């Protein structure tokens, strides 16, 4: 279904704050922002999708995503907040992309 303005704003906000939270977790743990982002995304999407990313410096297997997830979860509470923020950020991103797909159709019909 199509988003109401409040939902659009909400999802966008969650996404932006999610990215900010990823930068934050990068400042905290000391890992690669891309790595953390792809781990969060891996956990959000599911176990179905884990695949090596051309950008990353390491192979991303579920073993490694679990190592990194365990190093993220073991952080202090106030730091652990940003993990949840990033997660709901990714979920909001998925929902936001899936929501606007009709626009792509109506644009591509002219081409």
């Amino acid at each position: 279904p199509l988003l109401t303005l409040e939902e659009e704003v909400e999802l966008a906000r969650k996404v932006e704050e999610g990215m900010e939270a990823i930068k934050k977790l990068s400042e905290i743990t000391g890992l690669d922002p891309d790595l953390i982002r792809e781990v969060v995304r891996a956990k959000i999407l599911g176990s179905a999708r884990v695949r090596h990313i051309p950008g990353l410096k390491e192979t991303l297997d579920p073993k490694t995503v679990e190592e990194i997830d365990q190093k993220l979860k073991s952080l202090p509470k106030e730091h652990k907040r940003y993990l949840h923020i990033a997660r709901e950020g990714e979920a909001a991103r998925q929902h936001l992309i899936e929501a606007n797909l009709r626009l792509v159709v109506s644009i591509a019909k002219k081409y």
Binding site: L5, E6, V9, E10, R13
Partner: protein, 157 residues
């Protein structure tokens, strides 16, 4: 809707026999029974600030700025004065008829009673909540859950 907790101290004078004697008063609980209309007179001179609630009200009398008096008007007592009005000692502030009781919004925690003549002047410690609505535009978001207690300075939306 933010319900703001307020606790103040306000006096009420009543006929001695009509008063039902109790240590504290639950909201809605009978404060007294009157055989006949009793006007509640002003014990201090000054300007009147009438603060009205859903039911029952507050009369704050003051000279200059600083309040010289605070009176509480429970349910069943109809105020005889308007806001911003000059009153003198002895003129009726309100009129109580029949049975009067506490408002459902406010509760009296403790009651200090004083015997004077045929009357009693009750010093009430009152606790109530004053609501304030806040309109939220689609571009904002609520950072607080249902029934969550907030203090001063805390961000809601």
């Amino acid at each position: 809707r933010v319900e703001y907790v307020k606790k103040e101290r306000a006096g009420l004078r009543l006929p001695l026999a009509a008063w039902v004697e109790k240590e504290a008063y639950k909201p809605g609980e009978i404060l007294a029974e009157l055989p006949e209309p009793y006007l509640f007179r002003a014990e201090e001179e000054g300007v009147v600030e009438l603060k009205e609630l859903e039911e029952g009200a507050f009369l704050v009398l003051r000279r200059e700025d600083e309040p010289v008096a605070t009176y509480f008007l429970p349910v069943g007592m109809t105020p005889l004065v308007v806001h911003g009005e000059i009153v003198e000692k002895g003129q009726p502030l309100a009129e109580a008829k029949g049975l009067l009781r506490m408002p459902r919004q406010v509760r009296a925690a403790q009651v200090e009673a004083e015997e004077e003549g045929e009357t009693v002047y009750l010093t009430l410690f009152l606790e109530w909540t004053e609501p304030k609505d806040y309109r939220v535009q689609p571009h904002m978001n609520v950072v607080v859950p249902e029934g969550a207690r907030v203090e001063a300075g805390d961000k809601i939306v």
